[PDB]
Design a protein around this nucleic acid. Structure first.
Ligand SMILES: [Cl-]
Ligand SMILES: [Cl-]
Ligand SMILES: [Cl-]
Ligand SMILES: [Cl-]
Ligand SMILES: [Mg+2]
Ligand SMILES: [Mg+2]
Ligand SMILES: [Mg+2]
Ligand SMILES: [Mg+2]
Ligand SMILES: [Mg+2]
Ligand SMILES: [Mg+2]
Ligand SMILES: [Mg+2]
Ligand SMILES: [Mg+2]
Ligand SMILES: [Mg+2]
Ligand SMILES: [Mg+2]
Ligand SMILES: [Mg+2]
Ligand SMILES: [Mg+2]
Ligand SMILES: [Mg+2]
Ligand SMILES: [Mg+2]
Ligand SMILES: [Mg+2]
Ligand SMILES: [Mg+2]
Ligand SMILES: [Mg+2]
Ligand SMILES: [Mg+2]
Ligand SMILES: [Mg+2]
Ligand SMILES: [Mg+2]
Ligand SMILES: [Mg+2]
Ligand SMILES: [Mg+2]
Ligand SMILES: [Mg+2]
Ligand SMILES: [Mg+2]
Ligand SMILES: [Mg+2]
Ligand SMILES: [Mg+2]
Ligand SMILES: [Mg+2]
Ligand SMILES: [Mg+2]
Ligand SMILES: [Mg+2]
Ligand SMILES: [Mg+2]
Ligand SMILES: [Mg+2]
Ligand SMILES: [Mg+2]
Lengths: 62, 386, 97, 172
RNA sequence: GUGAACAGCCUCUAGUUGAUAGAAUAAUGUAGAUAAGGGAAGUCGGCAAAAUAGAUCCGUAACUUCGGGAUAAGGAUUGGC
RNA sequence: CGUGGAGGUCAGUGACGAAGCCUAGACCGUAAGGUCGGGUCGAACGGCCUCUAGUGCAGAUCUUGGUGGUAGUAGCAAAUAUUCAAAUGAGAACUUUGAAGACUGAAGUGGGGAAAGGUUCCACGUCAACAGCAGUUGGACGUGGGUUAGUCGAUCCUAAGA
RNA sequence: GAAAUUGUUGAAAGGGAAGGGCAUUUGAUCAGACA
């Protein structure tokens, strides 16, 4: 499959960069069927697509 | 026009071509002239180079500043297990040169020699010399006829010997076979000596003795393809030189319109046959003798092997020859030791050498202890031993 | 046969003098050749967990020794997994039941 | 389709060919000569070993300034290579010829490569850019391949001369 | 964040992970480097390279259009707690 | 001697094979050339007497087109760097997803525009050619979809000037 | 469907070019007269 368009839509819908988008490798069948922004919102809701946490830049030593 | 300034030529033209040797065992191209009023003896011996170390001795040379004073010298150690006589070969003089007439082999040969005749020993049926041994099954009439032919016609007698490679730390398992000319006695005496030594061993102390000048024949260390700067020693070109500076700038004049053979060129360096003469023997060592590395001054009990063993070689467990200076070839390489071709009386020969101390410190670093006992006395007890 | 064994591989001597940008990729190929020598299988598969252990300290920070578990499975192939131990020293080849 | 010159019996043979194949003509010619005259099954196993770099294809004509290997000693040469792309094209045609032989009714045990020939196809052209704003050609050399597999099969005398012959007969 | 700093060096957000590859480590190269003792003897010529380098304190000549020369030259100090 | 075309003639040759082409096959002529057999081929062509010319090539760093040796050779080395597994497929070092290791380090390899380009934007299908390796991918190929203003610009004003 | 150039098959020759002239040997091949 080619999920390039789904990752681009997921980043726009969630509001983060493409580097923070996680697509479930075990659910590529249902992800490939999601071509609209409404379908992406449903996948985010049920945990198929999640938002990864930001990389920590601690200021303890500072 | 003539060259602006005169300089001697780079390199020796008598050591051409600088190609790889045909075999790893360098050929012996000249034996000592035979004196037949002497007992039959070998003229050369086979050994393996193990490494180098250092000795201290008192100099005996009147008129020298260091007369009756200690000097520090470098020596080379050659592992020399006994060789095994397994045949003889006779030669006949001919207007076209020496020609081999007959070869007679011993009745039994070990697996060391037989491996030399095979390239795929693990798959072979090991049929070598099986039918030849049947010539001994009868009363030896076949062997007697061939030996009689050598006595009747031969003018030069040589013996086939092989090393006992299994006694060395090497992993080769395949022995080296070579011809050694017999000097002394008549042709019949040479053949009788060779026949009686079939399947026997000859020790190095029966060939060489203390304070004797010998020649070393071996193939030098290889270095692959080399540029002119290090291969021939030409001057490096200035830093400004375009197209590189490790070169010869002019390789010939306009005429003759060819590159001459005497111009330095890039090519193979090392792995050449060499014959270096006048190497005095400092010690003939015995393998079964404890305190091989001991002198009449040191008195301690220690072998010739340094602490940790010779680097890349191992331990010395057989007879060895200690020779002053350096020898062509690298460690673990088969070398041939030959008796002198002339009588030397330069007062550097015939002088008695008495070793006072032999260095057995580790050659794997800045070794500082001669023996393990000395190390224990200095450092004391460590955490590991308590 | 189907057999599982635990091995210690000395990567220090297998990466001696290797270019820094190639040391971690070279260790991957060294492990594949190591498994082929002991199991005789031309097909070697490395778990992604093992890949993280090799690349743990960058492209040029490969550990001197690694403790490996190699399994030969049904014609045959080898599967290499990491073994979680405090230190990789002092361990010899053992057979896993 | 008309093939090249052949001397085999068509009733006992099968043929295969391919045209305008985008594979090096020079590399394919060397590969074809390596199996010319071989048994079909022996040739097929040999081509598989080439892809595994166990045996090599000897290069005899188009071999200037190439490397040398120890795997050429089988054929008494020093220069040999492993042209994988040309080998796969030959393997496909060997498979097709064997399929055609089976359809006719020829047993594969006695089949051998009786004819194989590589011809030069029209070139395909691209451009390459050189220093100082120049343009040179950058072309491929395609090949035509054809092959055939076949079953193996196992007084005037003068009066003086007449008199001499007659005389000898009455002697003994 | 370091620091005088839009310098160099490391990181967060975001963005890429693209430039034909595999194996080996000869000569000669291109690029980056280090050298015992001597110290320009090299060379048309110190070309190239090396040495010097921040900050604080001390000290600073001839000459001068009195503004300079001047960071002249020449010395000392510098971490952590 | 040979070539294109013209007048006359042989009531000339020919789809039962004209012309052309191939032929270390045969014959004639000192030679320019002429004739025959075999193969290939498919629609026109020749001998002789005369007329006529854009009438004969090895060259001109000749013109146009085609093709070699060089040669599977020079080379495909700037911009720090890739690795494991799964999915897809006839086929995966290069496509997608996940994991890991890295870089740009805010005068960026980030986020918008003025010129200039003109559909390169987006989806589906899809790999012959193109992406100087590869390719299931693409700014490629095929078929369609997409740019919404009383307030943003143009439009209005004048500048050097026309 | 010519030539340059190329593949396969068949024949022949080849000790730092190849090609040519006169003469004959060997191999291959071929017309003419059997009045
Ligand atoms: Cl000389
Ligand atoms: Cl051009
Ligand atoms: Cl170099
Ligand atoms: Cl004529
Ligand atoms: Mg030699
Ligand atoms: Mg220059
Ligand atoms: Mg040492
Ligand atoms: Mg050449
Ligand atoms: Mg080359
Ligand atoms: Mg270019
Ligand atoms: Mg240009
Ligand atoms: Mg600051
Ligand atoms: Mg120096
Ligand atoms: Mg110094
Ligand atoms: Mg000077
Ligand atoms: Mg000078
Ligand atoms: Mg300078
Ligand atoms: Mg016709
Ligand atoms: Mg012809
Ligand atoms: Mg028609
Ligand atoms: Mg004209
Ligand atoms: Mg012409
Ligand atoms: Mg002319
Ligand atoms: Mg021209
Ligand atoms: Mg190259
Ligand atoms: Mg190349
Ligand atoms: Mg280049
Ligand atoms: Mg790069
Ligand atoms: Mg940087
Ligand atoms: Mg960085
Ligand atoms: Mg697009
Ligand atoms: Mg390409
Ligand atoms: Mg392609
Ligand atoms: Mg299109
Ligand atoms: Mg046609
Ligand atoms: Mg032609």
């Amino acid at each position: 499959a080619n999920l390039r368009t789904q990752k681009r839509l997921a980043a726009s819908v969630v509001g983060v960069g493409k580097r923070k988008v996680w697509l479930d490798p075990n659910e590529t069948s249902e992800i490939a069927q999601a071509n609209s922004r409404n379908a992406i919102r449903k996948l985010v809701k049920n945990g198929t697509i999640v938002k990864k946490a930001v990389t920590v830049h601690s200021k303890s030593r500072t | 026009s003539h060259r602006k300034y005169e300089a001697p030529r780079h390199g020796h033209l008598g050591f051409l071509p600088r190609k790889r040797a045909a075999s790893i065992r360098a050929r012996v191209k000249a034996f000592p002239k035979d004196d037949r009023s002497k007992p039959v003896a070998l003229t050369s011996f086979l050994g393996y180079k193990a490494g180098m170390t250092t000795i201290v001795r008192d100099l005996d040379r009147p008129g020298s500043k260091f007369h009756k004073r200690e000097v520090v010298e470098a020596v080379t150690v050659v592992d020399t297990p006994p060789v095994v006589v397994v045949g003889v070969v006779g030669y006949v003089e001919t207007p076209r040169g020496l020609r081999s007439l007959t070869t007679v082999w011993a009745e039994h040969l070990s697996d060391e020699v037989k491996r030399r005749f095979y390239k795929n020993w693990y798959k072979s049926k090991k049929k070598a010399f099986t039918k030849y041994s049947a010539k001994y099954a009868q009363d030896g009439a076949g062997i007697e006829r061939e030996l009689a032919r050598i006595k009747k016609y031969a003018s030069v007698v040589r013996v086939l010997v092989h090393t006992q490679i299994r006694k060395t730390p090497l992993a080769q398992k395949k022995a080296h076979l070579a011809e050694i000319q017999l000097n002394g006695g008549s042709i019949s005496e040479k053949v009788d000596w060779a026949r009686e030594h079939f399947e026997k061993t000859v020790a190095v102390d029966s060939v060489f003795e203390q304070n004797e000048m010998i020649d070393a024949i071996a193939v030098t260390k290889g270095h692959g393809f080399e540029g002119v700067t290090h291969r021939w020693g030409t001057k490096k070109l200035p830093r400004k030189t375009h197209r590189g500076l490790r070169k010869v700038a002019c390789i010939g004049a306009w005429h003759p319109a060819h590159v001459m053979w005497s111009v330095a060129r890039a090519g193979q360096r090392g792995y050449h046959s060499r014959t270096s003469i006048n190497h005095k023997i400092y010690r003939v060592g015995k393998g079964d003798d404890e305190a091989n590395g001991a002198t009449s001054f040191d008195r301690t009990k220690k072998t010739i092997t340094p602490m940790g063993g010779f680097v890349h070689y191992g331990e010395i467990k057989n007879d060895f020859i200690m020779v002053k200076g350096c020898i062509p070839g690298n460690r673990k390489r088969i070398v041939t030791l030959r008796k002198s071709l002339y009588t030397n009386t330069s007062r550097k020969a015939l002088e008695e050498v008495s070793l006072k101390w032999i260095d057995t410190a580790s050659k794997f670093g800045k070794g500082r202890f001669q023996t393990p006992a000395e190390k224990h006395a200095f450092m004391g007890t460590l955490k590991k031993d308590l | 046969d189907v057999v599982t064994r635990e091995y210690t591989i000395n990567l220090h001597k297998r990466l001696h003098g290797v270019s820094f940008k190639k040391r971690a990729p070279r260790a991957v190929k060294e492990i594949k050749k190591f498994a082929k020598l002991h199991m005789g299988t031309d097909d070697v598969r490395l778990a992604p967990e093992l890949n993280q252990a090799i690349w743990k300290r960058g492209v040029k920070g490969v550990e001197y020794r690694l403790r490996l578990r190699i399994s030969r499975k049904r014609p045959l192939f080898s599967y290499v997994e990491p073994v979680l131990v405090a230190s990789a020293k002092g361990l010899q080849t053992v057979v896993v039941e | 389709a008309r093939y090249g010159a052949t001397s085999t019996n068509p009733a006992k043979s099968a043929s295969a060919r391919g045209s305008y194949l985008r594979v090096s003509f020079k590399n394919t010619r060397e590969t074809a000569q390596a199996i010319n005259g071989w048994e079909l099954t022996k040739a097929q196993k040999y081509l598989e070993q080439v892809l595994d770099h166990q045996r090599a294809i000897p290069f005899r004509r188009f071999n200037s300034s190439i490397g040398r290997t120890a795997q050429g000693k089988e054929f008494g040469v020093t220069k040999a290579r492993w042209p994988a792309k040309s080998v796969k094209f030959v393997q496909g045609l060997l498979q097709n010829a064997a399929a055609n032989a089976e359809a006719k009714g020829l047993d594969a045990t006695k089949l051998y490569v009786s004819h194989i020939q590589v011809n030069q196809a029209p070139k395909q052209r691209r451009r390459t850019y050189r220093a100082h704003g120049r343009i040179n050609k950058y072309e491929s050399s395609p090949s035509h391949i054809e092959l055939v597999v076949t079953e193996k099969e196992e007084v005037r005398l003068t009066s003086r001369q007449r008199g001499r012959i007659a005389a000898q007969k009455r002697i003994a």
